[PDB]
Amino acid sequence: LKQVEIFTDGSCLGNPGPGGYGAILRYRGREKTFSAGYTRTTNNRMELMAVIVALEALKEHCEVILSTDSQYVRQGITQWIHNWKKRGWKTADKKPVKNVDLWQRLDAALGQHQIKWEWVKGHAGHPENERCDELARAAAMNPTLEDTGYQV
Numbered sequence: 813l814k815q816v817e818i819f820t821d822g823s824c825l826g827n828p829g830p831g832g833y834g835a836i837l838r839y840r841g842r843e844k845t846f847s848a849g850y851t852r853t854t855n856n857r858m859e860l861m862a863v864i865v866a867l868e869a870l871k872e873h874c875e876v877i878l879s880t881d882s883q884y885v886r887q888g889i890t891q892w893i894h895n896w897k898k899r900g901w902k903t904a905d906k907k908p909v910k911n912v913d914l915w916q917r918l919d920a921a922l923g924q925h926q927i928k929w930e931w932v933k934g935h936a937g938h939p940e941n942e943r944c945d946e947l948a949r950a951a952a953m954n955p956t957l958e959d960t961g962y963q964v
Contacts, residue, residue: 813926814839818866818878821944822858823952828964830955831855833862834947836940837869844869847947849955853962856884858948860914861959867921876925881932881941888915889922889929913961 822833832849846865850858859882870876880886893915896902901909901916909915935942 813873813875815875816870816877818863818876819938819940819944820859820862820866820878820880821882821941822860822862822948823855823945824853824858825949825952827855828852828962830952831858831959832948832951832955833858833865834944834951835862835866835869836944837866838940845947847951848957849951849953850957850959850962851955853959856882857911857914857959857962859884860888860911860918862944862948864914864917864921867918867925870921870925874925876927877930878927879930879932879938879941881934881938885918886929886931888918893919911961 817838819836822831824831830849830851831853833847835846837844846869863880863885896909896915901912903909932938932941935945
């Protein structure tokens, strides 16, 4: 299987507002960069969108080492998602899970790969994640896309 290293980040200039993501896929030394800006979104949604877009970019089943500093994505993946699915993607009050559109979009990408998650804390020592942060903030300055699933 192809082995690919992925690094991601995403955020808004003000939250909620313009936002964007940056992602880096690296395969055998070569890199591909992804980045886009959205006119109105949130920090959590861009953090999650970054990971989604990177995984969706894979066109064959891979072994993936994915580095993200997002507490939201980390906790969704390690704590929440298995129980959300059991509950038909609703919380105890029977409301759809917040950002269910993005979580389901993620869930469908996760199942297609053998993923090793490397949760990062801090940009220090993590130059690819820092670079993802710069891409995100640059895309946010000139957003072209609509974050359609975002609901205030």
